[PDB]
Amino acid sequence: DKIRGILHRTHSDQFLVTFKEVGRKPPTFGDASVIALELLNSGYEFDEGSIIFNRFRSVISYKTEEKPIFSLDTVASAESMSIYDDIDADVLRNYQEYSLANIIYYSLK
């Protein structure tokens, strides 16, 4: 809720969905599979994104970092992926989607 509270007076138009009830109980992996499942029941084809979270350093210090997300199959199939075997375009459809539930779980911890 607290991100949407700050960014509803200037960025009130670029909102796909919002969530609630995060972190009152301890966060888990099944919690990252509700964010990543309702993100597909939206129609929005997305081809580049990122997530922003606080990387825990110490008891006093935290560092806000960013990490990139490659989500279209076009950018996911490039020159480094020339050696890479049996996965198809339909399998790279499957593999990158589990990474979306994964990389939200790394930022829920």
């Binding site: 050696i83 890479y84 075997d85 049996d86 996965i87 399998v91 790279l92 593999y95």
Partner: protein, 132 residues
Amino acid sequence: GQMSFTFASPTQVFFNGANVRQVDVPTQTGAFGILASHVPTLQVLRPGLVVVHAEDGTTSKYFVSSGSVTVNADSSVQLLAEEAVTLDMLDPGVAKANLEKAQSELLGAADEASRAEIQIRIEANEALVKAL
């Protein structure tokens, strides 16, 4: 040879970063052995066992619900798992009646989305009964 067998779960980290010889991967398009210069493939998994082979006397037994492989360019395979459950904590008595349950509910599906879903449920429930 020179293979960091990574394998984990969100709850508890399993065999991690250790030089283990041979791994079984339960996958749609079958199971394939990882032999020491295996060709890199990013395939995701189906329900089934992983019987992982080391020099420590005998092999271990596990069970992956829905996993993913990312074997890289060098000799480094990383396996993931949502539920890398141990087998012995499973109860056979309630587990059999689920398989006859869902097939009895196949023709109660008036839509086309759930009719694939009950086909998913019997496939997940057939996966354990050959295992046990």
